């Protein structure tokens, strides 16, 4: 019943399909998203944004809450999975998950080892929404409803710079994105 999220081409986003998630801001707005890792940890890998206007990063795949609908819609919960071309440096899942509360920075990071599937409590940190960021593009947003009796965090997803990488954290201003179907790239 909700409205479909569209790629740069104007076509609706499709569950199952590979897309690049690209910053809706050029130059200093950076490039796209990817798996990356901290100096001092190897697994699970974290979500990062390429500094270069040039690099679209590692494509993702959406999994609808209900695998039966094929359209990724606004303000509907879903799972997001990096689809690394490269062999796994880890056994952890590339599935996005909100991390525990880094006491060190007052931020809730976005990371992997999420759990695709099973809506409800056990998977709460793995479910995300897309919202419209006003005038141009899309922001991600973490406010799950898979558990009608779980008190959870709820926020836009912005970008912060920590120890020389760009990471995604909850914030009250969400950072905007557009989507690029991966085939139409060369």
- What distance lies between CA 171 and its chain's CA centroid? 14
Positive or negative, the Cα torsion across 162, 172, 101, 30? negative
What's the angle, vertex CA 172, arms to CA 168 and CA 177, rounded to 5?
Answer: 50
Whether the Cβ atoms of residue 72 and residue 5 lie closer than 8 Å to each other: yes
Domain boundaries, the chain: 18-181
Please name the method used to determine this structure: X-ray
Residue (of 112, 105, 117) closest to 170 by Cα position: 105
Resolution in A: 3.0
Answer yes or no: CATH 2.40.50.140 is held by domain 18-181: no
Whether the Cβ atoms of residue 130 and residue 74 lie closer than 8 Å to each other: yes
Name residues whose C-beta falls within 8 Å of residue 64's C-beta, 6 or more positions apart in sequence.
15, 70, 71, 72, 76, 78
> Both tokens of residue 102?
């880094």
Q: Please, which residues bridge with residue 21 across strands?
A: 179
């Amino acid at each position: 019943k909700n409205e479909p999220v569209l790629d740069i081409d104007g076509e609706e986003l499709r569950a199952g399909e590979q897309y690049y998630v690209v910053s809706a801001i050029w130059g200093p707005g950076g490039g796209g998203l990817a798996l990356g890792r901290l100096t001092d940890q190897k697994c699970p890998e974290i979500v990062v944004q390429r500094r270069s206007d040039s690099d679209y990063g590692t494509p993702v795949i959406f999994h609808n809450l209900d695998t039966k609908d094929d359209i990724v819609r606004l303000s509907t919960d879903f799972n997001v999975e990096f689809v690394p071309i490269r062999d796994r440096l880890c056994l952890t899942s590339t599935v996005w998950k909100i991390d525990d509360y880094d006491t060190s920075t007052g931020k809730w990071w976005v990371t992997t080892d999420g759990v695709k599937g099973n809506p409800g409590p056990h998977t709460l940190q793995s479910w995300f929404k897309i919202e419209k960021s006003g005038n141009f593009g899309y922001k991600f947003n973490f406010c799950p409803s898979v558990c009608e009796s779980c008190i959870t965090l709820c926020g836009d997803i912005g970008r912060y710079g920590h120890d020389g990488q760009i990471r995604l954290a909850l914030a009250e201003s969400g950072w905007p994105f557009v989507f690029q179907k991966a085939s139409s790239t060369i």
